[PDB]
Amino acid sequence: AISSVLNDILSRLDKVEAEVQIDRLITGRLQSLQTYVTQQLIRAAEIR
């Protein structure tokens, strides 16, 4: 995407193409959560 920050994208771009920059940040961050949560579930199994 053109920036790390959602507000920069909504400051610069209109809906038709702001949604393409935002789709990248949603996809990357949802992959960052699923990675953290999988790592934590595997750790939780070790602590158990």
Place this chain on the structure above:
Amino acid sequence: QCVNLTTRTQLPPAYTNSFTRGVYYPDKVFRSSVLHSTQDLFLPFFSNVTWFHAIHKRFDNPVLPFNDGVYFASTEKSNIIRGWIFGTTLDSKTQSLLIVNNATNVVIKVCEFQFCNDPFLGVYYHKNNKSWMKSEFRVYSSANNCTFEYVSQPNFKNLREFVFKNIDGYFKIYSKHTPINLVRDLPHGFSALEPLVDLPIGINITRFQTLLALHSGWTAGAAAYYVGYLQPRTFLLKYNENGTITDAVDCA
């Protein structure tokens, strides 16, 4: 006016260890209590800076290449380093940049200059009035076309340092200073350099040339100056609780 200098000395490219200097703020953003990591043109730690020193007997201003960007520093009193030429030719076959200081202003000017072959700014010293008069401007014979101009304002050695970069059409300047009580070694310690000026010059640069003061029939001032190229190298930087870079790691 334009005149060639009497001394024709050459040979030893003197060197010194650039221990911990030539770090500078990578962008205009505040950060504090963080170990931030940045990839940029920087001065590689402990690299050989070329050292130049004027005696009384010795006066050297060689043409120095300018590849990716350069670090410059000087140890002074009585204001002897006064500017830089930059360009790809330096003979009015192509556009070139002039950066200079005098008795009342800094000037910045980019033109089809036909520079002098060994340029300087000249001075008359202690002429009855217990004052020194900046009086010769031996930088160029002609300045045919120009495409930008700017002007504004003019017990220890004065340590000065600068970093110069040309990239994405913009030429950029960073600087800092401190008073020092050391003979020749660049002192062990840290400071980043703040950004001062950005110039939209849009030219090739391949080389540069420092302009000393004269201080024929003259005496050279006891100033020294140090040059090193930058390289693209990742650096990791400790911003303290005040947001000043207090220590640095050269990642390579």
Place this chain on the structure above:
Amino acid sequence: VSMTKTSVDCTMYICGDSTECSNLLLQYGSFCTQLNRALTGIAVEQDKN
């Protein structure tokens, strides 16, 4: 015996205060509720341990 319990608001993490980002995040369906249920499962188990 245990580790720090964490809850992450999947909406604030992905989209923090952007409503248009939130309306795009709904197009990915159930994942934020599934991530809340996964971390709540870990967090309850710290007391059980």
Place this chain on the structure above:
Amino acid sequence: VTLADAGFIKQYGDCLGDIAARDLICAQKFNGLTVLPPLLTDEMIAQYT
């Protein structure tokens, strides 16, 4: 053992101004990552011991 966040409340003044530079715990909280306290306090667990 040096903990990072026990979960025992945050009240703004503990982070704003100075502390948000050196402290990462409130920068996590600002991005929707929240620690939850254990059900048993360190006094309760000690009492069990």
Place this chain on the structure above:
Amino acid sequence: LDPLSETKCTLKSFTVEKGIYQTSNFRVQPTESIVRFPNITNLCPFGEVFNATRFASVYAWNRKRISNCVADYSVLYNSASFSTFKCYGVSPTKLNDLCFTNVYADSFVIRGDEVRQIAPGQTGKIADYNYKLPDDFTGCVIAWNSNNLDSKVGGNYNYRYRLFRKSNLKPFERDISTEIYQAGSTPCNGVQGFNCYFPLQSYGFQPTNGVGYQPYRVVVLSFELLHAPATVCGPKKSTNLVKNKCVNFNFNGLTGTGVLTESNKKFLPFQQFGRDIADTTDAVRDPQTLEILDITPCSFGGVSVITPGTNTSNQVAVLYQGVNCTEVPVAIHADQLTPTWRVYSTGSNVFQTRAGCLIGAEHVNNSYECDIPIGAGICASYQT
């Protein structure tokens, strides 16, 4: 409707078993808005960038620097005279809603057919030897026909470009060298003999030469954006600043939400913003008055709802996780909140736990076995 209804929805069920349940986090909505821009007033000199007499040729494109001024762009974007107004990192509809560091208008003329060569990363002799835009170029390009302004019946010959070069030039380099170029190996240093060329060439702009072969005037606007001490900003009116409330702030196109506070951070004169580990701004220097404002996101947290089974009772209690409730009473629903319900904040049955603020449960001194857990040694149960 109420916290029970929020759990019935979250649990996808018309009945709920005994427990404590996560629900939508609460978050204080911003109570008003701020805008701040420099109190500069002089309207930027776009006239001598669009209605200049004679433009410069693309071999020596005339850069004009625009700074320390106010720019309305809607007066350009509304004008039908532009035959193209294509943007490469901002939407033109939002230029009036943005701040620029420095704007360089780079200006020249070309034949219409060549207008395509002006997009970023393009190629062809205009894009290769006389005017290259950088790969990550951020800006707009605006172009229109001037066959009715600067064509001649004999062809205008002031408008020249370049046809040869030892290499394709760097982005935003201009080359005004004039060396005779050799198409064979010939070191023809003297003059433009056979297979040797003056590397400049002329258009001949003539009032019937052809559609698109006719002359177009072009400007490239090239701005640095939203992260430096800016001097070319939009015409939107600045408001007064306010502090300690949650607010929809904008400074210099840094739109965001948060509570502003007087900071003690020692910025240097070149720094406009300070940033978090998360790459999000968390201190700012106001452009009206040189003071550093701390930005903190205004209060929010997980809401957990505590219930006996719905076949035991409809009554519930609410836990606001990590919240010192000296705040939730002040967050009165006279404006909006993320949770639409508020009846529980009617109060007097409000208790502080180290886990957060517990609302709608009666605190009692006698201890019991833990029925529903809360945290930090506290539990809750449904009893007489």
Place this chain on the structure above:
Amino acid sequence: LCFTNVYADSFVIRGDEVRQIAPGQTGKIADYNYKLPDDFTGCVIAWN
């Protein structure tokens, strides 16, 4: 294919702004007299 209802909207405009009739566009036609919705489903047909 088959359609719930079809509405044909009809008007005359200049050739230049035939680009303003795309969904989510802006400019005086798209702004002050005929706007297609952000998620419009349909076609635009135009001729001199």
